[PDB]
């Protein structure tokens, strides 16, 4: 499923993520896409913010739901 | 030193700690003056939240240093 | 007023500035002794991003505070 991620910046993204892959495996996507660490990614959506050990199917979320990527130390 | 804690009433409170001293143990400073639960309080220093496990000195914190005292909103 | 001004990994510089000194000027003091581009300076504080045509006195900051400077970087 494509998703599209937003930063508080403004600037979004469009990565390919299945909808039974885990939160972990996004991260690392990110972190290949755009280059930021997964230990520096903070995924919020919705206003709750996405856990690791969590699937995507655990948040509902839906196809071109806006996925926020906030600073995370 | 002394530090100058903003809470979310707009009240300014005056604390008294070492450099030293950790994020989570002046909490419970925080709670003896004004009675807010550490749990509740979250304080971020510049845009930058401040690890409970880190001290001042970690985060270059002196004598008239402001914190922004903000509410611990989590994922709802 | 002299000024700090927080990294990344925990160097603290500290510059003195004006009062009325617009957020620019303060960014070309960094770029002059640390050698960082305005371009890609970040200053962080309180949770909102300083804007270079702004002065100190809007954003209320006052002497002897830490401030965080992030990098701007332009990609996607």
């Not at 709750?48 to 071109?64: A, V």
Request: no cysteine; glycine share 6%.
């Amino acid at each position: 499923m494509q998703i599209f991620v937003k930063t508080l910046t403004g600037k979004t993204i469009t990565l390919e993520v299945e909808p039974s892959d885990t939160i972990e495996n996004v991260k690392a996507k990110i972190q290949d896409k755009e280059g930021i660490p997964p230990d520096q990614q903070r995924l919020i959506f919705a206003g709750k913010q996405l856990e690791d050990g969590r699937t995507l199917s655990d948040y509902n979320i839906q196809k071109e739901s806006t996925l926020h990527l906030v600073l995370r130390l």
